[PDB]
Amino acid sequence: KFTPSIVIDAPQYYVDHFNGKYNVDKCVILRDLQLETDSESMPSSLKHLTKPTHILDLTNNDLIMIPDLSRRDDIHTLLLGRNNIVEVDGRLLPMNVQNLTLSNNSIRRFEDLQRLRRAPRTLKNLTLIGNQVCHLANYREHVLRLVPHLETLDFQNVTAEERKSAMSFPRKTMEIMNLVVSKMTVERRNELKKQLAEATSLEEIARLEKLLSG
Amino acid sequence: XXXXXXXXXXXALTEFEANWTSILKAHYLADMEHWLVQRRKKKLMDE
Amino acid sequence: EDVAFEYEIQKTQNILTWKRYIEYWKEDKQIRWLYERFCSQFTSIWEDYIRWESTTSRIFWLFQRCLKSCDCDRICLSYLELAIELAMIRHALASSLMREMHRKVWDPVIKFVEEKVLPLTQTDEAELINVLLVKGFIWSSHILERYLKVAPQQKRNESLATLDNITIKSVYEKYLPQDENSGKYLPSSELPFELNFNYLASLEKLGLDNQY
Incomplete structure (x- = not known):
């Protein structure tokens, strides 16, 4: 599915979220399109991704891995929530990534997250809410061991004693x-x-499936 | 090729002849989408 | 697999639905019903494809059932008439009511072959002896009679005379000139002599004595 044609028509605009007033950060929208990981097609598609790109909104697709965007340096924010991700291989995150979202994916053991060791040192923000490793025993204290210099997980500010304990x-x-239905x-x-x-x-x-999903 | 056979057809004892000639013949949407709706109800109903 | 095929069919577009149905069938009562429904939405080509998928009485039965609600199917019915070599040959002819005149010309090969079988299944002194001894006291015709309303030549009419007698009389009456005041059927020189003798033999076989 991951064509060289759909990345080029990908809707894009400037957004103020990272600076408040001035529209100086650019988002590329690849959400709600059901893309999926092909080992040949995909790395020959994402070399037609526009430059610079600051926010890359890959949410609500059927990816099974972090798409290899390793060598790019423009992307600071990388939204991958609601995807069928298994393992977070940190070497394939962009060079200067800052701000990563992996909410409601398919990550379930600490050996899935184990390759976050290779993520950039300048990664500061992470989100794993709605995964199932989220619920495993003392998971926060583990993933802090992998990336101690981090600043936030699951929108909890990493306090001083937490990252101090990470060196123990x-x-x-x-x-x-x-x-x-859980919230009704x-x-x-x-x-x-x-x-x-x-x-x-x-x-x-079809109308009743609108109500059952908002 | 004369095409004079318009608005007419071929004309029984010939039926009895053909009954004897059997030896001569050897000698030589809504009814489905309802079900689909019910199946989808079944899939939804658990949740 | 077939759940996706049925789901695709719900979106429908008849040709694409037929292709999806064929794919589902590849990996047959439900498929036959679906094809019939698609044809009802459409359709003769679908029946031809059904006959191709078949390759026998049920096929011809479906052909006849669809024919009532209807041109290659006419070829199929005539081929069944060839397979009658047998009342379906006439039934196929009844279905040919739809050049426009070419529907008769498919039958004479079967008609001539039937004329070979039925008349074959049916000496100077003995000819008089047997004739003296006598003194002690049908669908095939209708096939030929239908064609001979509009047929071109006497080389056809030769084959009719091989069959019967009331029909043979009844058509030849239209080829024999009337008398000026009696209306009697006179012989003609437009007919050749052998056919005149056949008509004579018709009147003789029916015992129509004064007319003979």
Whole structure:
């Protein structure tokens, strides 16, 4: 799927988020398109990615790995949430990356994250909320051991004692449908249940899948 | 090629003849999309 | 695999749906029903493809059922008439009601062959002896009769005379001139002598004595 044509028509604009007032950082949007990792096609597509790019929004696709953007130095922010990522191989993050998002991916053991050792020293912000290694035992204290100089995980500010302690060691789309149901008024649950029992057309299923996902 | 056979057809005892000649013949959307809706209901209903 | 094929079909576009159905069938009652439904949405080419997938009575039965709701299927029915070598040969002819005149010309090969079988299955002294002894006291015709309304030549009419007698009389009456006041069927020199003798033999076989 990862063509050299869809990266060139990729919608793009300047955004103020990183500086407040002046539109001096540029986002490339590759979200909501179901791209997936091909070992031949993809590295011959991302060499048509526009320069400079500051924010690269690869969210809500079917990637299975960090796309190799290793040698590029413009990209500071790299959004990879809602992707089928397995392991975070840090050598394939961009050279001067600062700010990485891996929310709601498929990472489940500490040997998946183990290659974050090779991520850039200037990586300061990370996000892993909604993964399943997120829930494993004392996971924060482990991943801090891998990247001690980091500044944030899961939007928790890494405080002084945490990174001080880090030096002690040497010595599937239905996720969102459940996520809405987890966070819903019990009477509205007992109303959309009835609506699903009442359902009478394929287009009315489509409308009911709008409600079941916002 | 005369095409005078317009609005007419061939004309029974010939039926009985053909019954005897059997030896001569040897001697020589809505009904599916409903189900799809129900299947999709089944897939959704667990969650 | 087939779940994706059925899901694609829901989006439908008849040719693409047919291709997806063929792909699903590759890896047959449901497939036959789906093809019939697509043809109902369309359709003769689908029936031809069904016949190709077949390669037998059920095929001709479906051909006849579809023919009632209908040109290569006419070729298929005529080929079934060739396979009658047998009432479906006439049924195929009834289905040919749709150049415009070429529908008769497919039958005479079968008609001549039938004339070979049925008349074959049906000496000076003995000829008188047997004739003295006597003194002690049909679909094939209709095929030829239908063609001879519009047929071009007497080389066809020769084959009719090999069959019967009331039909043979009844058509030859249109080739024999009337008498000026009796309306009697006179012989003609436009006919050749052998056919006149055949008509004579027709009147003799029917025992129409005064007319003979």
